[PDB]
Design a protein around this ligand. Structure first.
Ligand code: HEA
Ligand code: HEA
Ligand SMILES: CCCCCCCCCCCCCCCC(=O)OC[C@H](COP(=O)([O-])OCC[N+](C)(C)C)OC(=O)CCCCCCCCCCCCCCC
Ligand SMILES: CCCCCCCCCCCCCCCCCCCC(=O)O[C@H](COC(=O)CCCCCCCCCCCCCC)COP(=O)(O)OCCN
Ligand SMILES: CCCCCCCCCCCCCCCCCCCC(=O)O[C@H](COC(=O)CCCCCCCCCCCCCC)COP(=O)(O)OCCN
Ligand SMILES: [Cu+2]
Ligand SMILES: [Zn+2]
Lengths: 269, 107, 59, 48, 353, 117, 535, 58, 100
């Protein structure tokens, strides 16, 4: 603190955010989304182009937050060692919360799998519902996920050895190795024999493997913004926190898929 | 006041931890390329070639399950097509993903 | 049986299970009355003795 | 301008309409809304 | 009814690992740390013969009382000889409780599919003691549960000595069988590595966060793979478990930081859970296929194979760490654990008798 | 926006901390791309100078009014928490020394003076 | 434009707490008028104010539950006292994620609109607070009412999760120079231990509510027993949220009481480490018990015995806190100011309302008390007399420091005595009505239950008068509040000692154990330029 | 000039005298449609929640 | 853990080194905050300490605190028949002789 011209710079390593308008606009978009989804499902509106505006405005509101998160870190230069630790602790406490939604859905499976009622004749997958064979396309998705978990390790170990062509190629291969998962799993939802309304079995199978679908669109977006921000020279060899959060998010989804494949697809009796 | 001098023992500690990231990431970078080009690509290739034949032989047992009459479709149990609230998109007897070639609702 | 107008306590029993319920409740109320009386006496001592006092035992 | 009437969202002194009207109307609305709701749902269901 | 036995066995295993592992917050140190495991190893085969004579419920509560009086003698003991005696009685109580409880879960739950699920729930108490403030709430919760157990077992219905209707096979006849020994060796060689890793980890390298991921993964692994092991075959689960234990053990020498141990430790604990809940029901299956159904001595053999690792672990591990070092020790135990895994395929269909 | 620093002796504000540029086809280094309060820590830690101190209060000697403990601040006030001369005897008592008055800690008695830098 | 960038587009943590207070006052007024509507109908036998409508009685009860579990106690105890005091106690400038604080405020006014619009478009939402599956389907409530009411429990959940992550992330790495995490004050520990339960409880509620929505409108049949489901599953997926929730409402109260007991009785708290360990034990043992709300659904005989054992254990850590508060108040000097009156009225009534919880914990005794007014009398002695009293004590403690304007002492004392008398008249004959056998959620009752219902309708009219007097106390605080500091010596934070002279006391006035009461009193916008020092 | 405009835009976002979200000469294209369509999305859910309280359906 | 004969030496040493009125009142305030009453030797040092700093009201208020610390009345009059040559030399008057 006894450096000579110390008064001209901030005396504590924490970020004082400037005034931003986006919290109000996110809430005003969620107001419209909640009321429009509550109303269109019981009449009262009819036209289905207000719900789509509500979802589009929500997603643009998150994108407009993340712009001001990027400019405050690569241009203004206010991300010290403490603020990075705070961001890492923060992201870990959202990954932990997004795991515990799947715990309730797994417990909604074992409360019916072990002990089925009398209305269904006591049997899993019940009579008249042909399940999905796990020696078909649900193998291809698993091997594509295990390969995508291996390709990003070649991308995080090429930004530390200062090789640029070798970070762009790996991220490109991973981005095409998550689009194929969505394309395969939308083909496994059009060639099925049972819907969301055909049992308690068809209702919990499309509600634990449908949240995963929404969670893996987010990796395609987060990897596009990690390829595009590396192409335009924003990443240094020691200060990159966009890659570290996308790597921790991918591996949790791989481990979750390896528990959605032994409990949902293989174990039926 | 007198300026604080810099300890030259905490200076080499920072400059060693930045040159030992360049080192220890020379063999791992070439290893994880070979784990991604020799035991990751033939796996996807073999399983894609297998599943193409497997699920293209099943693509000709579903093209004939469309001109079947309503009296030859498999019998419908209870709990089978729960329509107790009509869906708000289009007709009320169709979900998001709905092909007529595999699925039907017999009245 | 029928409810009574200004009731304070349970209705009358016709089953051994309800008599066991009444006996267990009357067993628990003993210890709860003892604990409430102990706490109330300690607050009474605190109000009567140590209100606006010159000496503070702060150690 | 830091002082004892600086952190509040509403102005209290040196004001055209005196503060009693905005203080009273807040509580009047707060204790008048759930009677309006009961009035509407009573009149929609026949009873007076 | 039948679930209160599961509660009693869960609390018995919890108190087993709590009084074993948690001694420091609540060479001489090598002999004193291993005083419990060797005396448990010696007195385990006697209780298997005793439960055939006097019955199941009495040794459990005798072991609870012996454990309580030995802990309260250990509370105010200063001399070395009395401390050694106190920990010896602590071990001999904890040897009665676990063996008789596991035998009585084997006796009551006769159906094969339910036995794996219930023992998968019951083995989860071996990590809550490792994870475990004031601890006086939890002791009185345990005292209330055992009061319920004593009320149902000894008060409402009278209990005599009542020896069993059938006479079991002796211990040597069980030891002549290859299947029971080769099933026990899987648990022994799986637990040997995690037994030896604990003393050498302060040598190589706060303390609780290194051991926490294994305790997190163990409960999830045992409670999931107790149920799903019936359809998949238990031999395949044992083979995959030994493979993952070996790979995660070799993953440790490449790690060069404290935070890099979190990911392999999960790959330890879940894997050893899938070793346990797969292989401990199937021993009780084998006696129902080849021998006469008395489950005491077989789970005595299983507890012997469990406690051999904790008996032999630190005393040999310190000598090997002084001799060669940590990474070659981890390498040799990992190659041993991988090499054992091919021969667990032999338990697919044993010959009936 | 102006001349770039090389050591923290030539840093008179946020106007001296932009730096040179990276080259086309190279993963950039932190000495080639950093602007704000991040580069100031970087130029401190490659010499040995800790810009953001984390050293607690002096708990060696007491405080007399003739010889008081000097607490350094860039303001006219600084909050000082006393907890004892053997460093945990006194409980936690907070004090505000000022350039016109010294705090004196009603239980143990140490006097604190403010040094304005 | 400066109005917008400072009270609508905000970053400062202390300027959102005042908005939380203004919102909480409104949402605690609305529910209290809704409770007065209920208690004026349950007065004498017959159909008095609502003419024949048994709808618009259940709607009023549901909306009185939601507006004061979710919209009054949590915004006051998290927004007004957590956002304001925790950075000043730990010594930080602002929170770690300020924009998340702004969104955690602004998600609540869209949650009020949907709940108020869940009672005008239709018959309404008379499902109770616990929105049970087979009643809240499409055969009894067929309209946009239940759907818009379970969308008001999503936005509040998002706000609470985003606030809890901010509270945990701030206290880990934004402390001053000389504070480890063993010298923290007790209020910070209370906020941390409620923020961990907010992480570990809310996903289960969100999952259960979303599956109820999918059962209502996308014909999925999770909880319908004609397709292979059970309603009882929802009860599990509700009550795993339900019992953490009721400690979330009470743990931030406890720490507040500790500060008052540490202040106006001039002694430190007896055994602080025991107190933080007791709060940790209470927080941990609120997750391993949830099924004592469901003893009559048809469980096993070996499962009731576990949940009677695991419920009575929670009495052991709470007794440590109560007896430590008595040991703190024992030796020292006590002056009876208006925070310590509410402090003294909290140590007795929480005990009375909590000793009834041991009677209800037994599965044998719950057969006589389930869905009966004994439960209502149990939880009103702890909610209305344990949490609201802590809120009033915290307001009367910290409002001169935040605002800079003092209040009349006499009117505050009259308000306290009116609250005490009216609330003790209201909720005590509910025990007698419960023991005689009056069920819950009934508008009309047999003629035997008349007389006590005449007495419990009298205390509510006493309590509303106390609320109006509280409004006048706030008005007398804001206008001419600079001249209300020489009327009484209550304005002094601590009294002169026996040997301490007045001339010495005027030079050295404030003696404290936290950073709070040494600030200038309007707190500055940027309150720490140079860091604070702790030895 | 080159792809390293990083050493050029860091002298612009510092010393700007405008807020960060409206500093570049491109933020018009993002901020005009967003605030334009938000005032229609909010004004449509305050017309259909007041029309619906009076019982009118579509 | 502290005994009578260590209390009555440590507070004598603390009273024989105060330099201002703040310090005399500080040591006097935490001397009457234990379970041990002060010895007649400690109070005899406190009046000389109040004499060095030249204050009169503190030398009166010491004798008023003894009436509250001491359990009975006989012990209070046993304190006042031994602290008498200290009072009549310095000149300190009690509160009940001034009637203020
Ligand atoms: C407000 C928060 C709150 C609090 C603090 C508590 C406290 C407790 N509650 Fe909970 N409870 C609720 C929230 C809360 N509860 C609510 C809202 C309901 C109504 C349900 C609804 O309809 O949704 C409810 C109802 C309820 C029931 C009845 C459920 C039913 O209707 O059948 C039960 C019974 O098991 C229970 C359990 C307990 C217990 C044992 C405590 C204990 O923690 C009480 C502890 C207090 C003490 C014990 C004082 C300590 C004093 C001592 C000196 C210790 C002395 C030691 C002995 C007594 C041995 N609660
Ligand atoms: C949040 C806790 C809470 C509070 C505060 C209250 C307040 C009151 N409640 Fe209770 N009540 C519940 C908990 C609570 N209640 C719940 C959960 C239900 C629903 C049960 C069900 O749905 O099954 C219920 C329902 C309920 C009913 C309906 C019972 C039923 O229909 O089966 C009744 C009727 O007698 C009743 C009684 C009262 C009364 C007379 C008050 C009065 O006290 C109201 C007067 C209010 C005040 C005295 C406090 C005013 C507060 C402020 C203005 C202070 C603001 C704070 C700051 C300034 C910091 N309540
Ligand atoms: C365009 C608008 C998109 C809006 C997305 C969110 C809301 C979706 C609600 C469900 C709508 C629905 O009907 O979903 C149907 C799909 C597919 O189901 P299907 O269309 O009946 O498939 C049958 C296919 N056959 C057999 C004919 C070949 O089923 C799915 O895959 C839906 C998955 C939804 C998962 C929701 C999980 C909720 C619980 C977690 C709560 C977290 C908060
Ligand atoms: C609602 C949907 C979830 C909302 C949360 C979105 C994910 C959390 C984002 C975590 C970002 C953490 C963070 O601050 O990282 C910055 C990068 O931001 C980023 O750019 C991260 C990109 C986040 C994009 C999120 C897209 C999800 C929306 C899809 C909805 C469907 C750091 O920047 P830095 O320091 O690493 O830069 C280095 C300078 N040299
Ligand atoms: C789903 C709701 C929860 C998702 C939020 C996850 C946010 C994780 C990333 C994070 O914690 O960073 C904060 C928000 O960034 C973000 O990623 C913004 C995400 C905001 C999503 C709001 C929920 C919409 C639904 C920083 O926010 P900060 O600006 O205070 O950091 C100021 C210093 N740079
Ligand atoms: Cu409860
Ligand atoms: Zn001090």
């Amino acid at each position: 603190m006894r450096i000579q011209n110390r008064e001209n710079l901030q005396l504590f390593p924490f970020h004082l955010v400037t005034n931003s308008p986006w919290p109000l606009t996110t809430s005003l978009a969620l107001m419209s989304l909640a009321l429009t989804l509550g109303l269109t499902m019981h009449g009262y509106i009819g036209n289905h182009l207000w719900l789509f505006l509500a979802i589009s405005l929500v997603l643009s509101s998150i994108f407009l937050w993340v712009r001001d998160v990027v400019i405050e870190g690569t241009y203004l230069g206010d991300h010290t060692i403490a603020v990075r630790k705070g961001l890492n602790i923060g992201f870990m406490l959202f990954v932990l919360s997004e795991i515990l939604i799947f715990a309730a859905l797994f417990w909604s499976y074992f409360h019916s799998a072990m002990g089925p009622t009398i209305e269904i004749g006591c049997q899993w997958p019940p009579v008249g519902i042909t399940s999905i064979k796990p020696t078909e396309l649900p193998l291809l998705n698993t091997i594509i996920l295990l390969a995508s978990g291996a390709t990003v390790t070649w991308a995080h170990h090429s930004i530390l050895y200062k090789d640029r062509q070798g970070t762009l190629v790996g991220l490109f291969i991973t981005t095409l190795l998550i689009i194929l998962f969505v394309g395969c799993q939308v083909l496994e939802y059009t060639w099925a024999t049972f819907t969301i309304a055909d049992s308690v079995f068809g209702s919990i199978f499309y509600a634990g493997t449908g949240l995963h679908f929404i969670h893996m669109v987010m990796l395609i977006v987060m990897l596009a913004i990690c390829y595009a921000r590396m192409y335009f020279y924003h990443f240094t060899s020691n200060h990159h926190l966009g890659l570290e959060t996308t790597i921790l998010y991918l591996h949790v989804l791989d481990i979750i898929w390896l528990f959605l494949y032994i409990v949902f697809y293989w174990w039926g009796c | 006041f007198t300026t604080v001098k810099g300890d030259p023992a905490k200076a080499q500690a920072f400059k060693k931890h930045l040159d030992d990231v360049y080192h220890h990431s020379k063999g791992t970078t070439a290893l994880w390329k070979k784990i991604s080009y020799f035991v990751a690509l033939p796996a996807i290739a073999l399983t894609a070639v297998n599943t193409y034949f497997v699920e293209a032989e099943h693509a000709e047992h579903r093209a004939h399950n469309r001109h079947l009459s309503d009296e030859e479709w498999p019998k419908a149990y209870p709990y089978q097509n729960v329509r107790r609230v009509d869906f708000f998109w289009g007709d009320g007897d169709k979900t998001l993903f709905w092909n007529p070639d595999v699925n039907r609702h017999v009245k | 049986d029928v409810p009574t107008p200004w009731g304070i306590f349970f209705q009358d029993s016709a089953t051994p299970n309800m008599e066991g319920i009444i006996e267990l409740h009357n067993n628990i109320m003993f210890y709860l009355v003892l604990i409430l009386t102990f706490v109330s006496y300690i607050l009474y001592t605190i109000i009567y003795n140590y209100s606006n006092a010159t000496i503070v035992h702060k150690y | 301008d830091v002082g004892p009437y600086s952190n509040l969202p509403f102005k209290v002194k040196n004001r055209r309409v005196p503060y009693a009207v905005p203080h009273f109307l807040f509580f009047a609305i707060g204790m008048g809304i759930p009677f309006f709701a009961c009035y509407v749902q009573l009149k929609r269901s026949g009873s007076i | 009814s039948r679930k209160l036995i599961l509660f009693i066995v869960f609390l018995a295993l919890l108190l087993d690992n709590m009084l074993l592992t948690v001694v420091v917050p609540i060479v001489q140190v090598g002999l004193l740390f291993a005083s419990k495991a060797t005396v448990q190893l010696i007195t385990n085969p006697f209780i298997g013969l005793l439960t055939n004579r006097i019955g199941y419920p009495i040794p459990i509560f005798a072991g609870f009382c012996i454990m309580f009086v030995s802990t309260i003698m250990f509370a105010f003991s200063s001399s070395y000889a009395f401390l050694l005696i106190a920990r010896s009685l602590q071990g001999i109580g904890s040897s009665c409780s676990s063996v008789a409880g596991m035998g009585m879960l084997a006796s009551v739950y006769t159906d094969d599919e339910e036995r794996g699920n219930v023992m998968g729930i019951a083995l989860g108490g071996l990590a809550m003691g490792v994870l475990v403030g004031k601890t006086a709430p939890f002791l009185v919760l345990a005292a209330l549960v055992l009061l319920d157990g004593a009320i149902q077992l000894f008060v409402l219905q009278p209990s005599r000595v009542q020896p069993e209707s059938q006479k079991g096979t002796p211990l040597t006849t069980l030891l002549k069988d290859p299947y029971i020994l080769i099933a026990a060796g899987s648990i022994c060689f799986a637990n040997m590595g995690i037994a030896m890793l604990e003393p050498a980890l302060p040598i190589w390298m706060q303390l609780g966060v290194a051991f926490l991921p294994a305790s997190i993964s163990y409960l999830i692994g045992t409670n999931i793979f107790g149920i799903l092991a019936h359809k998949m075959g238990r031999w395949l689960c044992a083979l995959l478990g030994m493979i993952i234990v070996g790979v995660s053990i070799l993953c440790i020498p490449f790690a060069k930081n404290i935070y890099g141990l979190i990911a392999p430790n999960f790959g330890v604990g879940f894997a050893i859970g899938m070793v346990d809940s797969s292989m401990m029901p199937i021993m009780g299956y084998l006696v129902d296929l080849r021998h006469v159904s008395v489950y005491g001595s077989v789970y005595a053999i299983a507890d012997v194979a469990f406690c051999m690792g904790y008996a032999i672990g630190p005393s040999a591990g310190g000598a090997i760490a002084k001799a060669i070092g940590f990474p070659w020790l981890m390498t040799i135990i990992g190659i041993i654990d991988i090499l054992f895994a091919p021969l667990c395929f032999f338990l697919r269909s044993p010959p009936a008798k | 926006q102006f001349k770039t620093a090389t050591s923290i002796a030539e840093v008179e504000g946020l106007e001296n901390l932009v730096g040179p540029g990276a080259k086309t086809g190279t993963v950039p280094t932190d000495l080639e791309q950093a602007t704000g309060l991040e580069r100031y820590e970087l130029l401190g830690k490659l010499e040995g100078i800790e810009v953001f101190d984390e050293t607690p209060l002096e708990a060696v000697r007491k405080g007399t009014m003739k010889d008081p403990i000097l607490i350094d601040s860039y303001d006219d006030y600084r909050y000082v928490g006393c907890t004892g001369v053997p460093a945990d005897s006194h409980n936690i008592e907070w004090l505000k020394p000022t350039t016109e008055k010294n705090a004196r800690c009603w239980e143990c008695g140490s006097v604190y003076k403010l040094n304005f830098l | 434009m400066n109005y917008i960038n400072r009270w609508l587009f905000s970053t400062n943590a202390k300027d959102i707490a005042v908005l939380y207070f203004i919102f909480a006052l409104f949402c605690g007024l609305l529910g209290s008028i809704m409770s007065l509507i209920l208690r004026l109908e349950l007065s004498a036998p017959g159909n008095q104010i609502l003419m024949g409508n048994h709808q618009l009685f259940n709607v009023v009860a549901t909306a009185h539950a939601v507006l004061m579990v979710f919209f009054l106690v949590m915004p006051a105890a998290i927004g007004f006292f957590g956002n304001y005091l925790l950075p000043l106690m730990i010594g930080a400038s602002d929170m770690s994620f300020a924009r998340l604080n702004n969104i955690s405020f602004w998600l609540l006014p869209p949650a009020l609109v949907s709940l108020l619009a869940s009672a005008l478009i239709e018959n309404g939402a008379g499902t109770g607070w616990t929105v049970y599956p087979p009643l809240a389907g499409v055969q009894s409530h067929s309209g946009p009412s239940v759907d818009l009411a379970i969308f008001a429990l999503h936005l509040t959940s998002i706000s609470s999760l985003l606030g809890a992550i901010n509270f945990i992330t701030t206290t880990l790495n934004m402390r001053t120079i000389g504070m480890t995490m063993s010298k923290l004050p007790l209020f910070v520990w209370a906020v941390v231990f409620t923020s961990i339960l907010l992480l570990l409880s809310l996903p289960v509620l969100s999952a259960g509510v979303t599956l109820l929505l999918l059962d209502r409108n996308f014909n999925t049949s999770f909880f319908e027993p004609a397709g292979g489901g059970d309603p009882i599953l929802y009860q599990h997926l509700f009550w795993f949220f339900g019992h953490p929730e009721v400690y979330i409402l009470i743990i931030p109260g406890f720490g507040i009481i500790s500060h008052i007991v540490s202040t106006y009785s001039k002694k430190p708290v007896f055994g602080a480490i025991g107190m933080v360990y007791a709060m940790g034990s209470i927080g941990f043992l609120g997750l391993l018990v949830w099924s004592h709300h469901m003893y009559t659904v048809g469980l096993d005989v070996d499962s009731r015995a576990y949940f009677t054992s695991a419920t009575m254990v929670i009495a052991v850590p709470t007794g440590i806190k109560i007896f430590s508060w008595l040991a703190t108040l024992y030796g020292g000097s006590i002056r009876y100011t208006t925070p310590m009156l509410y402090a003294f009225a909290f140590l007795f009534l929480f005990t009375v309302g909590g000793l009834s919880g041991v009677v209800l914990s037994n599965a044998s005794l719950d057969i006589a008390f389930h869905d009966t007014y004994y439960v209502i009398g149990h939880f009103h002695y702890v909610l209305s007399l344990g949490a609201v009293f802590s809120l009033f004590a915290g307001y009367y403690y910290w409002s001169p420091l935040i605002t800079g304007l003092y209040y009349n002492n006499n009117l505050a004392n009259i308000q306290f005595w009116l609250l005490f008398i009216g609330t003790n008249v209201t909720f005590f004959p509910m025990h007698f009505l419960g023991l005689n056998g009056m069920p819950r959620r009934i508008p009309d009752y047999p003629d035997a239950f008349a007389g006590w219902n005449a007495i419990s309708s009298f205390g509510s009219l006493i309590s509303i008068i106390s609320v109006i007097l509280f409004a006048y106390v706030i008005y007398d605080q804001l206008v001419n509040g600079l001249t209300n500091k020489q009327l009484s010596t209550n304005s002094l934070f601590k009294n002169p000692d026996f040997i301490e002279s007045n001339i010495i006391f005027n030079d050295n006035s404030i003696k404290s154990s936290s950073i709070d009461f040494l600030l200038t009193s309007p707190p500055l916008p940027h309150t720490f330029n140079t860091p604070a020092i702790q030895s | 000039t080159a792809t390293e405009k990083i050493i050029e835009l860091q002298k612009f976002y510092q010393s700007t005298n405008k807020p960060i979200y409206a500093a570049h000469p491109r933020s018009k294209y993002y901020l005009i449609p967003y605030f334009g369509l938000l005032g229609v999305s909010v004004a449509a859910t305050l017309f259909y929640t007041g029309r619906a309280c009076f019982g009118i359906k579509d | 853990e502290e005994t009578y004969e260590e209390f009555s030496q440590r507070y004598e040493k603390e009273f024989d080194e105060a330099y201002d009125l703040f310090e005399v009142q500080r040591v006097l305030n935490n001397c009457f905050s234990y379970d041990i009453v002060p010895s007649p030797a400690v109070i005899g040092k406190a009046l000389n300490a109040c004499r060095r700093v030249n204050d009169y009201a503190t030398a009166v208020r010491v004798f008023e605190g003894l009436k509250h610390k001491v359990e009975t009345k006989e012990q209070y009059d046993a304190y006042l028949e031994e602290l008498k040559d200290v009072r009549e030399e310095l000149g300190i008057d009690l509160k009940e002789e001034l009637f203020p």
